[PDB]
Structure 1
Amino acid sequence: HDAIMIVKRALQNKLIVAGGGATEMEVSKCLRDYSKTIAGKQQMIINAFAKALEVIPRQLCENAGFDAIEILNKLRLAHSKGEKWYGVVFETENIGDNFAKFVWEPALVKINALNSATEATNLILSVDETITNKG
């Protein structure tokens, strides 16, 4: 029954990406390399967006007991060198491949959340005045 429930959620959504910080670290790394043509005031804005994407794996390691300081330094070294599929193990702290452990996450969760976080951010940054009427 446990094996059926794992493949059940994978059949509903055919778009699957590697979780466990793998995809989160690669997106932040690619934006820093492509920022060379984004050079100018638009470069530092996207460079901060890549750093803002690191809060997701942080709280996951802090809530599980792992040290968020050491896990981020060792993950980037193993991600940039060799294979990019190396993630963070959720049981025992160590470098590992989530694609090897067959632990997957649906991509539509991160895609819909990325557009919703950016759209809601543009609404708040655009408000220079707020008036609240009583009633």
Structure 2
Amino acid sequence: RQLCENAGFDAIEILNKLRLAHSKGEKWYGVVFETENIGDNFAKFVWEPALVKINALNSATEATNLILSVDETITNK
């Protein structure tokens, strides 16, 4: 939704036509910037290592779960 909003695409008409086409078109369908539409990123060659996405999510949650745990902020002078 952000890669779209950044590039100035139709953010909702891409996600809506992506979610539908991800249940029938399998995993590797993503944003192909080169035509302003949906596509398979294996053949589009959009490739990134395993660690990035797993370490991304494992950290993003560590943050989210740490903040919700806080119920009191005390700050000294």
TM interval, shorter chain, is: 0.7 to 0.9
Q: Percent identity?
A: 100
Q: What value does the CA root-mean-square deviation take over the aligned residues? A: 1.3
TM-score normalised by structure 2 residue count:
0.88
Q: TM-score, normalised by structure 1?
A: 0.53
Gapped regions of structure 1 (runs ≥ 5): 1-57
The whole-number CA distance in structure 2 between the counterparts of 1:84 and 1:109 is: 17
Q: 1:129 to 1:89 in 2, by over 3 A?
A: same
| Cα offsets for 1:66-125 (capped at 9, x unmatched) | 111100100011111143322221122122111111220122111111111111111110
CA distance in 2, matches of 1:98, 1:125: 36
Number of residue pairs the alignment of both structures matches: 77
Higher RCO structure, 1 or 2 (CA under 8 Å, sep 6+): 1
Q: Which of structure 1's runs of 4+ aligned residues deviate more than 6 A?
A: none
- Paired with 1:83 and 1:124, the residues of 2 have a C-alpha distance of 35
